[model samples]
Target: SMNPPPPETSNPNKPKRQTNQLQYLLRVVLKTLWKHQFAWPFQQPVDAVKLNLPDYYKIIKTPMDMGTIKKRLENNYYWNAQECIQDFNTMFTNCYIYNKPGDDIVLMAEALEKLFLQKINELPTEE
Candidate 1:
C-alpha cells in the first residue's frame, strides 16, 4: 500500500500520519532509539527543578525529548521528517550544550546522536 504525497493547497493543517517510505523509516528508527539503553535520559521530559538545574530552563528555551517526539509523531504532530530530526537533534543538542564535558548523559547523547544521524542518512527524500 504505497501512499503518495498529496498535492499542495487545500490540505489539512494537521498531518494524520506518515504517507511514504520515509515515514516507515522514521517509525523504525524511533523504535530502535527507544530500545537503546542510553536513551533513558532522553526518554522523558527534562525536570530542571527536580534535577536542581535552575539555570537549565534559562539556557534551553525549547526542551524536547524522545518520548515527547514519539508521542507527537504517533499523534501526527510532526509534518515531516525534518521536524522529527530537529527534535532528535534538539534533545542531544540540549544535553551537549547544558551538560559538562564528558558527563554521563552527555556521552549518551553523543552516542544517540551519532546513531540517529547514521540511521537517517539511509532514508531517501522524496520531492
Candidate 2:
C-alpha cells in the first residue's frame, strides 16, 4: 500500500483573517490602476475650480506643475510593487533578455525596496 501525501498547512505568521495592510495593497493596486486608466486614460482630469482660476494659464504653463497632471502621475506610481515583480520575472524567466540565474528574489526585493523608499522620501511635502 502507498502512503498519501499530507495536506499543506497554513503559515502561522500569516493570520487566517485578512490583514488590512495586505488587503489594501492588493485592492489598491487593481483599483487605482483601473480607476486612473478608465477615468482619464493618459492624463488626470483637472479640477473645475483649479481650471477656472485666474492663474490657470500659469499653472498649465508647465504640465508638471498642473495639479491634475501631478495627481495622475503620482497615483499611477502606486504600481511600484507590481512593477518590481514584473522586472524580476523579466530578468529571471525571460532568458532572451538575459541568460543568467536572476531568480534571486531576496536581492530583487532589497534593491526595489531601497529605490521605493528613496522615492517616497523624496515626495513633495506640499501639493
Highest lDDT, which number? 1
lDDT of each: 0.72, 0.32
Candidate 2 local lDDT, 1-127, one digit each (tens): 1212221222335324433332343344323333432223212322325445344323332221112323322344322344323432332232222223464533443443344344444433321
lDDT per residue (tens digit) for residues 1-127 in model 1: 1211221222347646565634754577788888898889888877765677777777886778887777766666666777677777888888888899978888888888888878887766655
TM-score of every prediction relative to native: 0.82, 0.21
- Of candidate 2, the 10-residue stretch with the lowest lDDT total is 1-10
**Residue 95, candidate 1: alpha-carbon lDDT:** 87
* Regions of model 2 farther than 4 Å from truth: 1-103
In model 2, how large is the Cα lDDT of residue 50? 43
Off by over 4 Å in 1: 1-17
Model 2: lDDT to the true structure: 0.32
Q: List the residue pairs that clash in candidate 1.
A: none
